[PDB]
Design a protein around this ligand. Sequence first.
Ligand SMILES: Cc1ncc(COP(=O)(O)O)c(C=O)c1O
Ligand SMILES: Cc1ncc(COP(=O)(O)O)c(C=O)c1O
Lengths: 444, 442
Amino acid sequence: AVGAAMRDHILLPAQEMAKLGKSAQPVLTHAEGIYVHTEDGRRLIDGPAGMWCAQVGYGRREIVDAMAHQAMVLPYASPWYMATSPAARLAEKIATLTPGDLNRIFFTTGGSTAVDSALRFSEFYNNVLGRPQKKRIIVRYDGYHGSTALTAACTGRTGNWPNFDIAQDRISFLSSPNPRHAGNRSQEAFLDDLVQEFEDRIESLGPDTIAAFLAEPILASGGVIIPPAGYHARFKAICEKHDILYISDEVVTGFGRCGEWFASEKVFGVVPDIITFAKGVTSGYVPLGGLAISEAVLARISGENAKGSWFTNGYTYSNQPVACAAALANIELMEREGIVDQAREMADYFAAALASLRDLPGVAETRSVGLVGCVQCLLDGTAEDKAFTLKIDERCFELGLIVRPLGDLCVISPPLIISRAQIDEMVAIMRQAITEVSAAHGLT
Amino acid sequence: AVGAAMRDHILLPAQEMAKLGKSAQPVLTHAEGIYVHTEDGRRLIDGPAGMWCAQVGYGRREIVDAMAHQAMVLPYASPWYMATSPAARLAEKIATLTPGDLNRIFFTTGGSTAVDSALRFSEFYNNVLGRPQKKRIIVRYDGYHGSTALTAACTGRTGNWPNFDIAQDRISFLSSPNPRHAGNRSQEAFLDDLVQEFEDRIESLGPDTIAAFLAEPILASGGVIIPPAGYHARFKAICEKHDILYISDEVVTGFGRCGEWFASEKVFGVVPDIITFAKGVTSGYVPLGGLAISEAVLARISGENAKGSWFTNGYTYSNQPVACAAALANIELMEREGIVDQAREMADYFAAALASLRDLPGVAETRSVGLVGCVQCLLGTAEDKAFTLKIDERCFELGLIVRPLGDLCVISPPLIISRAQIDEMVAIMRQAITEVSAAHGL
Ligand SMILES: Cc1ncc(COP(=O)(O)O)c(C=O)c1O
Ligand SMILES: Cc1ncc(COP(=O)(O)O)c(C=O)c1O
């Protein structure tokens, strides 16, 4: 009956239009800890933490109570005219966690709107500065920045492109900083070529035309792609030379995922100009997004430098008290129980548990940073491998584990509170699923 | 200290950059019924119902208990892979309330992303049909459709435009359908000119280049601008002639605001191809938006006609169980207490109460539809814009929030507002207009 309602009345994200009104999705009913349950009652490990969001897991009354209390007391105030305590205190809190002087926050309802607003900010910025040509955005193939028209245009995941008008002169794609595209080169020489590609792009487009460089610290939806060490710092140095805003998209990496509140500086060696965030900010309990903007950047277009300008960008649910109260409870809980510390302390055990799968003939590679990980499966990335990995994903589900299928990769990013025992349980399910499917494909 | 934290750590929507770090907003602390209260302890009527969203007003535990329950049980499920009861039941519920066959729903987190997705669909739709040139969007001056880069560019409120790269070749602006722009013409003849301008625009651009016509039924943020009667049906007929998708933006008008679940057909006489909604679907308790798409539209690009296409648009919080449970509880509460019927029955009284202000020398005009209305104040000019801001400020001091909008004071109260509370609201307005007028010498 729930399935019949989904089928007849919902348009799904990434819906195969040939199977519109015939599609089946598993029905989830309830959840606790790292676990979710089907309408059959069967318990499964939420390997992706929903969608890299459920940092503290499911069933935390602390977030729910703070949500409910604020919803009753004062659920809405217009952010154009009226201030609230939740928004004020949340912005104050996040300002203590960000690198450098990124101490002023603009709030949105999710990651796309935050990145959209970061990009609209880069426009505004250069317009106020009297640089109307300085508008272009530099991104990478395999990157993901959202699903608004502009943010999808900034998205390097080309599987999302068909039947959308993605290409435009404002946006230029650099190569994916994938270590396994290094070929006959060392990782250090591959990084040399990556960096040179960027400065060549700057030269051919003209620095005076480029507003922003937009980059996830690791390319999560691309398949947990970790740039060769030093990438972020080398690119930042180049941005600063040409006065190009570095927007680090920490929608996935932020709020504990890479063992830190923000991965940009502490893990990846970059102090960005802007950080975007979502997901983990509320542990996926309610929609919130936003962007932290550098004080020195804002000073150049405000005060005596304002030129009578007004930042006429904003959403109805920007600074919404309910979502901000929930996030505040989330962060306070994560602080209280050292959950960010927990993720940092579990990272090596996580990496090593995944690495024990490299034993298998079906496994090409495993990688990870913090508690985001990846198992690459090849028949030995062709079309045969994608279907093979899909069958592994399916077998994992049957044995009690949700993995996220990304082409030839099984992706896991579990709640940050996952134990050593639960990690091994997860891995043992993956091992069984890989072994059995590989046998049906003649791997020996 | 709350105001110190806003000052130093928050960038506001429409922030005056000359006053960044010095802007002070009144702090709201708590709310109940139609009222909200400031930090200083003053009680205020929420005249705009927040931002045309608080349909049932504040403190309804029905919505909050349903939020809390879902948040504990299953707060998140990935919309790409996993289904949920609240999302499914809510989509089913909305489908019973929309005009025509607008029976399939795509959820987003708000109004902008609903409209952004509607427009991305129009693009997807024509690409799947083998019509890659059929992409242009027709909108109107004074219209408002959002704050994403695409939806802002579709926004005809030119006050939002400076220092943003709004202009683009895909989007063309018609004249605002504003009755006070008729001049020497009758309202009917003015309507004839609006319709003719649209037809001429289609011919000038070429019909085969136009994907969508995007329009609020009434132009809310644009200044409670109600098109001459017949506008919507006549534009729709023209849309259908050229296979242009009529996208009716009911982000403000939807869920009771015009005395109806959806204003499009039952008030303004158009069955659209797509309806976008948000705000009042949850009574403002939690972010939710979405769009309702016509079954016939979708059939042309799905099933046998799919051409191996995949609608690869979607947000992480699409179909979010908590927002959908809140919305479902909101709608069910509105059904039980007949709140849509209440708003329909209160509209004439609301209209007449505002019209009692026309008495005043300072008041030029009042207009309304359903439970959205406005009062025009003149001494027009920027002097009148500063005059109206003063009236707004005096209203606040006397216990009423109004939305300032040029020379208009705009109200859109919770739909459960009583005759008594309407009178209270108007008495505050009357006092504030008489006081500011006398101080300006009138
Ligand atoms: C890195 C990154 N940025 C932006 C987004 C878009 O966020 P949302 O889907 O909440 O709009 C995503 C998607 O989760 C993302 O992974
Ligand atoms: C008619 C209309 N459409 C779209 C929007 C944008 O909605 P949101 O601010 O939730 O993104 C607005 C503002 O609420 C609106 O008034």
